[PDB]
Amino acid sequence: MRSHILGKIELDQTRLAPDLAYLAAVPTVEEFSNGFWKHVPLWNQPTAHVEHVPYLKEIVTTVFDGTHLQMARSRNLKNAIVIPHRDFRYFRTFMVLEDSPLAFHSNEDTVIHMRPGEIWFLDAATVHSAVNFSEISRQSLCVDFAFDGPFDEKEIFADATLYAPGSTPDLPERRPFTAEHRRRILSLGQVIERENFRDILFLLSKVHYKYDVHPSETYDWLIEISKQAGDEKMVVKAEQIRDFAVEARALSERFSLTSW
């Protein structure tokens, strides 16, 4: 199902500053990851954190519910990109808590800029990605819901007035993706090496946020760049990464992005 705003609660800045202070300092425990990302599980039965610097506690308790919501966590990301990929009826809500301008999300053909307070529905089964082109903080609250007991996206709210499904979204404009531009991306066939394969993967993954092209093409480009490079082991690895990212196809155990 396509991504869309479910509603939009207003956020009490000062009442919420100390909660972000906490979350930023909580240490939590320690692949295809880059940059800074971080999670603080809030619901999993609460956690030692809930009580710790509240407010969000209120929100997830005053805004949502129903006998089932199987999760909840903070989720920050600075100067990072998570490559496009599908995770595999498992609802999932996302709410950014602060103003981070160069922070975006993508899902199949769309690119969105979440604003403070909006509650978005995101689908796990589709090809998605997230990014932060800058170091400005982007703390978010994420709440997943449990179903297969037939629903209406309204019934995730404990109070149905919060539900406002028509708020318009910030959909960034993207430049047309020309054929000249595709050929230039293929020019990386000249410079890709096994020691920078991973770096190129991350670079290609960024293109769709600015240009009008499906993000799954990231993988087609990488495979072609690989063939242009004449490196057979690279071609094979770029094909496995693509089968893993858009096909959920399990990657071998011992599979390594940096040991060919």
> With respect to Fe ion, which residue has the nearer C-beta, 87 or 170?
87
To the question of whether residue 115 is assigned a binding role by annotation, the answer is no
Encoded tokens for 82: 């998570």
# of chain residues touching its own copies (CB under 8 A): 14
Beta strands (DSSP E) in the chain are 4-8, 36-43, 72-78, 80-85, 93-96, 103-107, 110-112, 118-121, 128-132, 140-143, 175-176, 211-212
Torsion-angle region of residue 159: left (phi > 0), alpha (psi -120 to 50) or beta?
left
Binding partner at 11 among Fe ion, its own copies, none, C-beta below 5 to 8 Å by kind: none
> With respect to its own copies, which residue has the nearer C-beta, 24 or 125?
24
Cβ-based neighbours of 235, under 8 Å, separated by 6 or more: 223, 226, 227
> With respect to Fe ion, which residue has the nearer C-beta, 139 or 226?
139
Q: Does 1 bind Fe ion (CB under 5 A)?
A: no
Distance between CA atoms of 16 and 167, rounded to whole angstroms? 23
Give every strand in the sheet of 118-121, ordered side by side: 4-8, 118-121, 93-96, 140-143, 72-78, 36-43
Q: Does 134 bind its own copies (CB under 8 A)?
A: no
To the question of whether residue 128 is assigned a binding role by annotation, the answer is yes
- 226-250 burial, b for 16+ CB within 10 Å, e for fewer? bebbebeebbebbeebbebbbeeee
Q: Does 30 bind its own copies (CB under 8 A)?
A: no
Q: Does 17 bind its own copies (CB under 8 A)?
A: yes
Q: Does 24 bind its own copies (CB under 8 A)?
A: yes
Q: Does 22 bind its own copies (CB under 8 A)?
A: yes
Q: How far is the CB of 10 from its own copies (least distance, A)?
A: 18
> With respect to Fe ion, which residue has the nearer C-beta, 87 or 247?
87
Q: Does 42 bind its own copies (CB under 8 A)?
A: no
Q: Which of 12, 58, 87, 135 binds Fe ion (CB under 5 A)?
A: 87
Encoded tokens for 18: 């100390």
> With respect to its own copies, which residue has the nearer C-beta, 6 or 16?
16
Annotated binding site for 2-oxoglutarate: 138
Q: Please give the residue ranges that form the binding site for its own copies (CB under 8 A).
A: 14, 17-27, 52-53
Annotated binding site for Fe cation: 85, 87, 128
